[PDB]
Structures are given as C-alpha cells and as structure tokens.
DNA sequence: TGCGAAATTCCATGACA
DNA sequence: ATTGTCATGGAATTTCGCA
DNA sequence: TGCGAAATTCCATGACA
DNA sequence: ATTGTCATGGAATTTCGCA
C-alpha cells in the first residue's frame, strides 16, 4: 500500500517499469499494459490472489498465470505462482512427474554359478493337478534355471523346494522380491542356517528381479507354445520345459545355460561335440575362459529430460496400492543417501528408513 | 580313444530298504562315473515306477549317455527299458552275481552307504530330511585320485559349502552299542 | 542321397563349396568344416531335422540354427530354418513382435464447435449418492466438457443425459469406443432420429478416443485434488469439476474451453475482459479467427524399426482378453484395404471384415 | 458503454402449474438477454429449493453476471439470495405488479408460452420428453432484430438443427376445440 | 545496439481400466 | 467402416526495460 | 584384390501380475 | 540396505567362395 502510494505520485520503485503510467481509479492502483489495463495489487494481496486462481482447477504454472493475467499484473508473477505451486500439497502428491528416472544400471554379471540366485514366483495359473504357483529359480551367471510347482506363493513351499535344490549345491546369495514367501522370519532363519544371504529388491521393481522375470516370459511363452489347443496342463510341462530352456542357446552368448553350467552338454537332441577329444580338465579350463568373456551390456544413454537423486533432494515415493481418486505420490521426504545412481535411501512418510527404487520416486516440483 | 567326461554314465543302484522317514524306504543312489557326483533320491518302493519318477527329475536336468545298474528288477523292467529308449538312454547292466562299476564309483557307493550308517544311529527315521546335506558332503569329498571334488569335476568352480571336517566315517563305541540295539 | 553321391567322388554340386573334403563315415555324409566335422543329410530329412532342432524349445532363427550346427551343415541352412518358423502356428501366435507400430496421426481438430462430440464412460467409481460411473462427453473443437454421474455405464443411463445434453445444440458426429452402451441397437435408432452420425474407435485402442480419455485424465486428477483428506463424496464436485476444467486455460492454445465454445468468460473467476469494448458481432468475428488459427500438432518422427501396413500383407490381430497360457495373437489374417496408415480391414480369424488398429496388429514374421 | 454481451444477463421465470409430465408440473425459464438463448428446466414447484437445483445445473455451464426476475417468493428468499451472493450474481428484481424485462426477453418468453400451449395440447402429460425440442427450436428461431438465432449469438456458429419450417405457433380450428375440453 | 533479466515458448514425460 | 491427447515444469528461446 | 552371396552380428521391440 | 533382461527377426555388417 504504502509501496504503490509512491508509484502514483511517479516515483520509481524497482520491478515496476518507470515508461508505464500507474494511475488510480475506483480506487484501485492501475497500469495501461500493452495487453490493457490491469490493477496492480497491494503486495500484502499477492498471495491470496494467486492461491484463489490456482484453487480454481489446480492448475500449474502458466494455466494459473493466465488467470492472473486477465486482471491484475505485478513485478514477477511467475515468481509468487510458482511460490503456491510448491506450497500446494494436493497439487504435490497428485500430478504427474515430467522428469524420467535415469538411465538404468546393468550390474555385473555374477563370476560364477551358485554366486546368486534369483527367485520368484509365476502365478496363479490354471489349476493343474492342484497346483496354481511355479517357483522359478534362476542362477544369475547361468541362466540355469529350477522349476517348482506349488499350491501357494508360500515360504513353507519354498523352502521345500530350495532344499531339494540345495541338494545340489548352496548358492552364496538369493535375490527375490519383497513378496511375503520371501521376506519372512522362516525364510530369513532357513538362509541363516545354510550360510546364504538373503538380498531384496527395491519395493515394487520387477526390474530389479529381471534376470528371474526375464526367464519366466521364456517359462509362460513355451508352455503357451506347447499347450496351443489343449487343455492347460503344465504341471507335467515343467520338466520338459525346464531341460528345454537350459539347453537353449542364446544367441548373443552363444551358448546355453547348461553349457556355461557344466562346460559340456549332456544326452540332449542336438549336443554339441567340440570339446570331445579335450580331457574333462581342458575343458574345465575352456569353460573358465568361456565365463569371463561373456557379452556384458552398458548403461544406455540417459533421456533428454532424466533426474539424478541427490542426497538432501525432496522426492516422493510412489503410493503402492492408491485407492480410486486418491493421490499417486506420497507426501515429501528426504534423500538419505544415495547407494547407486538408480537406488536411495529416504527418510520414509511414516518416518522410517526406506531403500526405493528411482523408479518410483519423483523429484518434488518447484524445490 | 576320447576322455571321460559328465554324463557320460550314470550308476544307479538301490540303498534299502531303511527304516521309514516321512513314509519313505528306499534310497536310489545315482552317481557320474567321470565326477563321482551323487544325487539321492527317495522312494517308496525298488520299483520302476518309483525309479523313473526319481531319474525324470534327474534327467530333467542333465541326461546321460548311459545308465549303468545290476540286473536289479526296477531296471530290467521292459517299462524302464521303454522310458530310456525314449530319452535315448543307452541302458548298461553288469553281470549277474558279478556286480561291477569303477573303482571310482565302488569307493563313492562304500561312503554313501557308511554315511548313510553314521547318521541313521541316534535317528533312524529322521534320513529324510538329511538327504541333501549328505550329497552336499558327498560331492564336496576330496578325491584323492583326481585331486578334485565331484562339485568342482561337474561345475569347474570351488564351492561355497567345502567340507574340510571329515566325519570319522566309522561308528564310535557309543554309536556301535545304539546300533546293536535297533 | 544322389546329389550327395556325386559329390563323395569329387564331383561338384552347386551350393557346396569345392574347397572342402567330402567324405564317408559311418554310413553318413561328411565334412571336414573349420567348425570341426559336420554330418551333411540328404535333402529329403534336412525339414525333419530343422523341425526337430525347433521343437526342443520354439526358439527362433538363431537359437535353432545353432542347435542344428552342433551336428549338421547344409548349404543355406538359415534359409530351411526361416522356412520351418514361418510354417510353425505356435510360434506364429505366441511370439511378440519386434516391430513397432508407425507413427501416430493426428486428425485435425474438429472446424466448429459441435462438430463432433466423444464420449466415454469413467469407472466404477466409489459409490456416491448411488452412483458409480461418469458420463464424460467432451466437445472435439473446443475441449468444452459436460459430466454427468450415472449408475451403470448404460445404454438407458446415456440416452438420459445427451437428451439433456442435446437440448442444447445437436452434434453433428459421436465418437465412442465400442463399449456396450454405445453399441446397442437402442443407442444407434437414438441417434438416428435426432441425425448424429456415430463413430466408433477401432477395438481395444482407446488412444483413438484420446480427446475424451486425456480429459478423463484431468477430471479424475481434480476429483482427487479436491477429495485429499475427505471420504470420496464426488457426486457434488461433478458441477464444480466441469466448472472448474471448462475455464481451465491450456497454455499451448492460451484459451479455456469455455472462450473456445461461447468467445467471452462468463461471471467466472478471473473473467478476461478484453472484448469488453468489442460489439458481440465483433467478438465472434474474432471468435471464428481464433478457432482457426489454434496449435494443430503434426505426426512425429517414425521410431527406426516401425511398420507400415500392405494391402494383401499378412498381419495378426492381438486377442482381446488373452487367457492364462493362452496365445497372445489370432491366427494370420490378410489386410483389405487401409484407411489410413493407422487404421486397416482385415479378413477376421472368424471370417469377418474387421476395422482394426496396427497397434493391435503384428505383421506376421518369415512372410 | 459497453455493448451487451452474453452472460450479462440471465431473465428468469416460472411458467406453471402445467399438468403433470413424469412427475414435474413447473418450468423454470432461463433466457439470456443479450442471444435471446434459452434454458428450461422443469422443476416440481416454484421454490427456493427446486430453483437453486436447476439453477446448480446451468451455472455448472455458464454464470451470468446478473439475474433477473419478479419478486416471486422463490427468487426474493433469503436462501436464493445467499446461493446468488456464494456465485458473484447479482439478483436484479422488477417493481411489484409492474414486470419489466427486454423487448427481446418479453417477445422470447411469449414464444415460449405459446409454444408449450401448442405441444400441450393432445398430450399435457408429455411435454417432459419435449422439453429438449423445445429448447432446440426457441434457440433456433429467427430473430428479426438481431437477424441472428439465439444459437449463432452464442456460439458464433450455424447450427446442425436448423427450424425453416416454423410452426403456425397459432391453435388450429381443432387444436382450439380438443383444448376447450382440457 | 546490447546487456541482464523477465517473460514466453518449447517439449519430454506420463496417464487417461 | 477410421485416426491419440494435453497439463506439466525445467530448459531453451525470445522479449523487455533500459541505455 | 574384388565381387555377389551367405553368414554373422547388430539391435529396437516388447514382455516378464 | 541396492542395481533390468534377453529372445526375436529384419537390417547392417562382415566373411566366405571364387577368381
Ligand atoms: C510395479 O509392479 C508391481 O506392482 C509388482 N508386481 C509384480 C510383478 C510384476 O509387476 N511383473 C511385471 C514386470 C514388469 C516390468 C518388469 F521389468 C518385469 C516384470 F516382471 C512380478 O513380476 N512379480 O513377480 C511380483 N511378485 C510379487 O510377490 C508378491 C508381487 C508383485 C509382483
Ligand atoms: C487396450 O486397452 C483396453 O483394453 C481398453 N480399456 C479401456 C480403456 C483404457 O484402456 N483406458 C486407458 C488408456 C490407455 C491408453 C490411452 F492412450 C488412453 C487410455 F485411456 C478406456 O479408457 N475405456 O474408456 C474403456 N472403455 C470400455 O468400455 C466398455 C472398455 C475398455 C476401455
Ligand atoms: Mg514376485
Ligand atoms: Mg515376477
Ligand atoms: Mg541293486
Ligand atoms: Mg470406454
Ligand atoms: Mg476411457
Ligand atoms: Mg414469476
Ligand atoms: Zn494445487
Ligand atoms: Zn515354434
């Protein structure tokens, strides 16, 4: 008030162009703008203004400035706009994000088999002789892969099945999603007993378990390619489906997951002969070699418009299970620490610890 | 002539039958020549069809070019003979009376069967669940001939469980007196 | 077996090269390749043999290829493989595609107001007031939108609220996707009589109804703006949100709805007043140049691999609602006619004439 | 001054008690005065409540800077002067027994009058369903002032419905008879 | 005739079962 | 017989205020 | 030393609730 | 406290067979 009182007299004050003249009338301070005559408010004013045009649809940055404009102006708008886009809660935890995650990380490929595992479950399928779930256990340096049948997504099945294929050999590390068979102090204490380390992924990241999801789109594709005018019966499909995948070439590798297992094919249609006339160990050796040389694929390049998390930043974590008409972000939190540029720690809505994929997060709009 | 190698040959043979664990009696005993690598499957029965119900696990992993075995029932069966022709499964019997295998493979049977003893004692129905550590135990014995474990023959790398505490194999005096007993 | 004879006494055959020792062993056909040896098959098993190489696991050109190569060589083996996976159903309607779809159109905007309407059914909702589902009916020239709840996404419940609708202005065109209230008999003969042509979206692309689902986007994100912190009683903020998104400026056109459909804010908040001194005859004259001069988006740039339909070429439809293990593409149908590079008929699975999308087509593989 | 607009001005107005149609037995008429456009909305009584209900309804599409009517009961409560002061609408009233309105207004509402009396007749019970038509036809009539219908005023378009056949607007010889009955 | 800053435009991103 | 769309907020670009 | 063709590699595309 | 993956089939590139 006291501000605009000096503008009408001619005195310059800054942000307000001096080649423009500030008049009053009907006792409201004005100025003729290219675009017409606005009134200038008073700054005590500003804030209330840009919240009654922002509260008409919630509109973000220039759609509320073009309702602004249509009456008032003053020095930096966008600035006061952008004030109450920040302040907003529900504009915070309801709009989308314009920034992509970036670009994705290609861990090492594990030095050797039985270095991790990966796990998860497909499922629920059509019943087929009373089991609905296939337990898929993929080696990662490998991609020899176990199948189980089960009646349930359950740590009790799960463990019945990984004690017959630690029969075979312990792995030094499973990975598995945060589903409930997995994540359970019975899981945890029968890892603990044989020495395994039990590593999860993010919440709600099936990428972080592709190398197990990639291998059940193989699981799902060949038992559909199999079943093609017949009843759904997989349960005896699973067999033939898992020596047929493990002695399946990939193309980019060269060789099949029984091969870069055991360095030698066994009775299988169509068994490669090369190493016949090696000894077990010149070919153990070849094998060696075969693991270290394996194609390993680079990050890809980051999107035009990807973000970084930075400790310190305000993020927000992507709701789970948002009910209808219900926000899909959760409130602001913290970057803790940052373990990898895809991977953080935040100081969670509940107030706890909590280690979250990129993916799911955003960068909180307007700082 | 070409080296041994995996899968070559498989020696099958029954173990039982054993006292009942979890309503199971028998033990087939499936062990590669060239490795000595041993997988143990429970069944119910010596039979055929318990016999390929426990080698169609197996052979859903790696199959071999030949089974070796006695001229046992389970595996003179014309079912059996028929279930190996179709996964081309040469199947090798040894002479009747005259049982014969490898050195190699002699040696593993004797440790399979005296470990198997060691720990039937003190909980002879409770085998069962202890079948997987006894193969781990198994396939990560140091061979003396091949200076190798069956687990590093069969895979190439060292293992994550190593065995370096060997049980005595033979029973203690207080492990003789219980098994009198039962 | 008379073409290999020849070529054991030395004797050449085009397609092997002569470099090479052919020889016999064994009673097969062999040669000495850099490889290693390979067994050379008469002609008349080499489809046998691709066939058995291919059925172990379905895998594709490569992973066959490489199966067969462990034992065999023949010249031009690729060309047999290709052969046998474009002959194999299975993996014809299993396998995805590696194609994408070409670029998207984007149809002009609609020259008046009323021109075209699109419709489109938002729900189930929580119930309110006993209602369920939103009639959305989004005007295509100007963006204007008129929402009406109802409790079933109905043929009855529809004919209900255009009648109200109508007594307005009568469109000239309808679009909706083929949902079942705009599909009836009783909706088509309700059309009929008041002369609205209706046009329906290709099935399963409700990116063809895009005017009406981009507007379904922001009605559902106010709804939840509006609903933070309250039980979702969102019958009464039906009029606010209609309200609220019709004088909603899109900052790429600088106008609301509103100004597009009437030239002039009504007693809204921050109602522009530039035309204030402008007769009303002046007003729609600058009306009718502003709806003719608005942003008009163009077809973006073709993604490197992408696919354009043939008339005659062999395409497949994706199934609907795909069953578990159940193949995810209907058998190879013939293109008719295309009616736009987008949009094609096709010789149905069923024998029909059907008017499809490519994004719901793969061009089937190996021709 | 500033040339009229649309929006300026919104007329309102009962018409009724008609005979029942699916439960209803008034309409509240809406025009603008600038386009002449008009709104009906059929309520079940002349009050505050049915009112504000409709009226909920078209300010959804459009609010007028001004409403007009008589110093009917429903438009002078208190209640409607609260729901018009929550929208920025200023309520405008015409003196007691002297209703004043617009050339325009005035002719448009005689339209209206004497096109429900047309359509009333044969079937008084049925003009709900019509409403819709009636709306249609009144904001596509032509005006002789404006040499514009109330639709192309609004929306500086022609319309998909135009009405080159008016209707006599006149009683027939025996719509005249069958209504003396009624 | 050019600078710093504000204002406007650009546009990738994502969501409309 | 049909066809994506557009609010969003950082960044890129243009325009403004002044000289 | 270079050509046409076959063979191999490349890699965008899409799907793993 | 953790992290995408890889079969696929046209296209791009390299290698082969021959001279
Ligand atoms: C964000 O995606 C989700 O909400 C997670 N959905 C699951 C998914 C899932 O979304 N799978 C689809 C999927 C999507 C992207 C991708 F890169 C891989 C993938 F598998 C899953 O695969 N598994 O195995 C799950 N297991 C669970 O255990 C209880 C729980 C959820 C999933
Ligand atoms: C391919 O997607 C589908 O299967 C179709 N789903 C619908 C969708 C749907 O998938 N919406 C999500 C969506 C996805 C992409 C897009 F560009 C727009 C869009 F709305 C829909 O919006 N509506 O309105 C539907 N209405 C129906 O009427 C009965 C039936 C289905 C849908
Ligand atoms: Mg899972
Ligand atoms: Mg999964
Ligand atoms: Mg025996
Ligand atoms: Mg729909
Ligand atoms: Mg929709
Ligand atoms: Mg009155
Ligand atoms: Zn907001
Ligand atoms: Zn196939």
């Not at chain 1, 090369?274 to 390049?301: C, N, V």
């Amino acid at each position: 008030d006291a501000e605009l009182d000096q503008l009408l007299q001619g005195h310059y004050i800054k942000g307000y162009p001096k080649q423009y003249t500030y008049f009053l009338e009907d006792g409201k301070v004005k100025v003729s703008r290219p675009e017409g005559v606005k009134i200038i408010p008073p700054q005590s004013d500003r804030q209330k203004i840009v919240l009654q045009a922002h509260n008409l649809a919630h509109t973000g940055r220039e759609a509320t400035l073009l309702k602004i404009a249509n009456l008032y102006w003053w020095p930096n708008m966008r600035k006061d706009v952008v004030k109450q886009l920040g302040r907003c809660q529900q504009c915070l935890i309801t709009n989308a994000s314009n920034k992509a995650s970036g670009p994705i990380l290609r861990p090492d490929r594990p030095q050797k088999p039985f270095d991790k595992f990966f796990i998860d479950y497909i499922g629920p399928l059509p019943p087929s002789q009373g089991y609905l779930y296939v337990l898929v256990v993929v080696d990662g340096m490998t991609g020899f892969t176990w199948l189980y049948p089960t009646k349930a997504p359950s740590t009790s099945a799960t463990v019945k099945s990984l004690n017959v294929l630690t029969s075979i050999a312990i792995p030094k590390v499973i990975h598995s999603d945060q589903g409930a068979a997995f994540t359970s102090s019975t899981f945890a204490e029968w890892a603990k007993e044989r020495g395994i380390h039990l590593e999860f992924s993010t919440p709600y990241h099936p990428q972080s378990s592709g190398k197990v999801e990639r291998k059940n789109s193989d699981i799902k594709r060949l038992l559909t390619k199999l079943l093609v005018g017949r009843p759904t019966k997989w349960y005896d499909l699973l067999p033939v489906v898992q020596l047929a995948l493990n002695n399946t070439y990939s193309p980019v590798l060269k060789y099949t997951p029984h091969q870069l297992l055991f360095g030698i094919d066994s009775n299988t249609p169509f068994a490669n002969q090369d190493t016949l006339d090696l000894t077990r160990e010149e070919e153990l050796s070849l094998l060696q070699e075969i693991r270290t040389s394996l194609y390993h694929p680079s990050t890809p390049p980051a999107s035009s418009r990807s973000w970084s998390p930075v400790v310190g930043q305000l993020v927000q974590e992507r709701v789970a299970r948002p009910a209808s008409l219900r926000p899909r972000w959760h409130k602001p939190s913290t970057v803790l620490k940052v373990l990898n540029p895809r991977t953080v720690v935040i100081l969670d809505h509940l107030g706890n610890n909590r280690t979250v994929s990129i993916d799911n997060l955003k960068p909180t709009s307007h700082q | 002539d070409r080296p041994q190698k995996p899968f070559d040959k498989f020696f099958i043979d029954y173990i039982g039958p054993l006292p009942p664990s979890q309503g199971y009696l028998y033990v087939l005993v499936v062990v590669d020549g060239m490795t000595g690598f041993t997988w143990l499957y429970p069944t119910k029965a010596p039979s055929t069809s318990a016999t390929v119900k426990s080698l169609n696990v197996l052979t859903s992993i790696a199959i071999p070019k030949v089974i070796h075995s006695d001229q046992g029932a389970a595996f003179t069966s014309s079912t059996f003979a028929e279930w190996a022709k179709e996964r081309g499964i040469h199947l090798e019997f040894s002479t009747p009376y005259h049982p014969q295998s490898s050195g190699k493979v002699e040696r593993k049977n004797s440790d399979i069967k005296r470990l198997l003893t060691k720990l039937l004692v003190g909980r002879p129905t409770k085998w069962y669940d202890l079948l997987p550590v006894v193969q781990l135990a198994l396939n990560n014995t140091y061979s003396p001939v091949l200076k190798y474990t069956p687990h590093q023959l069969l895979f190439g790398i060292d293992s994550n469980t190593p065995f370096a505490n060997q049980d005595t194999l033979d029973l203690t005096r207080e492990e003789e007196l219980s098994l009198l007993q039962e």
